[PDB]
Amino acid sequence: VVDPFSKKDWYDVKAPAMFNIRNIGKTLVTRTQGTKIASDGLKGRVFEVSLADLQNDEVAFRKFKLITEDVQGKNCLTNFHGMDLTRDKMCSMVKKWQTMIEAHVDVKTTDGYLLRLFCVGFTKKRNNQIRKTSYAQHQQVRQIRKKMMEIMTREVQTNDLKEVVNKLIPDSIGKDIEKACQSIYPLHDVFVRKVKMLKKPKFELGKLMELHG
């Protein structure tokens, strides 16, 4: 009986200021049906946006996640929520005759955003290596896992999100660990494979306004 898309509306998603592109798509929202507010039904959605759909000089085997927190007259003013890699890239990296090394740390930001960072780094066959295998002994792996736990402990702790996200976008963190682990066992593809989001502060409007402009 009822054609429901006459009862809809159309909002715009707009990225925060770390990225070149801001308006990156649409999002359907049913209007206020008296009781439930149309802004209320929008207030928590996540957006699995890639990298080259946000910053143009960049390779898009990475992703980001973004919360429509505020509804300000047909704009989704959008926060940072999380980060992970493309599963095709993940399945591409895990070869056989090398070693997978991981670590995970729970770090706070300076502004109350509790993060859980992950790390993935692989051993690297040398450019004169003849042995098919490139494995690190288990104590070498516990060394490398500690610096992986060390480097991304300080950098979220020292900073806030607007500086942390900017470290994520060229993966400034993972390029540090690559140089910092050459002396133990040379690594190959060291990334922050995934970043979770554990807790948030009380919500601040003007923090988000300054996070856009």
Partner RNA sequence: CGCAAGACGGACCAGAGCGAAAGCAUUUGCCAAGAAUGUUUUCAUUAAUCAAGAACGAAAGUCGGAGGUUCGAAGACGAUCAGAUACCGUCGUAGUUCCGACCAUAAACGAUGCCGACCGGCGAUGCGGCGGCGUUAUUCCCAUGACCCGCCGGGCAGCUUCCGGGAAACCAAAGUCUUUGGGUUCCGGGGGGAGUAUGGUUGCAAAGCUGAAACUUAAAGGAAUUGACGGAAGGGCACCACCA
The residue (of 67 and 173) whose beta carbon lies closer to RNA is 67
Q: Order of strands across the sheet with 68-71?
A: 23-30, 8-14, 76-78, 68-71
Other CB atoms within a 10 A radius of the CB of residue 116 amount to 15
Q: Does 184 engage in binding with RNA (CB under 7 A)?
A: yes
Pick what 140 binds: RNA, another protein, none; C-beta below 5 to 8 Å, kind-dependent.
RNA
Q: Does 191 engage in binding with RNA (CB under 7 A)?
A: no
The residue (of 26 and 95) whose beta carbon lies closer to RNA is 95
Pick what 158 binds: RNA, another protein, none; C-beta below 5 to 8 Å, kind-dependent.
none
Show contacts with RNA in window 1-40 (CB under 7 A).
none
- Shortest distance (Å) from residue 117 CB to RNA: 13
Q: Which residues of 119-139 are buried (b: 16+ CB within 10 A; e: fewer)?
A: bbbbbbbeeeeeeeebebeee
Q: Does 128 engage in binding with RNA (CB under 7 A)?
A: yes
DSSP E strands, the chain = 8-14, 23-30, 49-50, 62-65, 68-71, 76-78, 82-85, 100-108, 114-122, 194-199
Pick what 94 binds: another protein, RNA, none; C-beta below 5 to 8 Å, kind-dependent.
RNA
Burial class (CB in 10 A: 0-12, 13-18, 19+), 97: exposed
Helices and strands: H and E segment counts in the chain: 6, 10
Pick what 179 binds: another protein, RNA, none; C-beta below 5 to 8 Å, kind-dependent.
RNA
Q: Does 134 engage in binding with RNA (CB under 7 A)?
A: yes
Q: Does 130 engage in binding with RNA (CB under 7 A)?
A: yes
Pick what 6 binds: another protein, RNA, none; C-beta below 5 to 8 Å, kind-dependent.
another protein
The residue (of 6 and 139) whose beta carbon lies closer to RNA is 139
Q: Does 209 engage in binding with RNA (CB under 7 A)?
A: no
Q: Side chain identity at 57, as an amino acid letter?
A: D
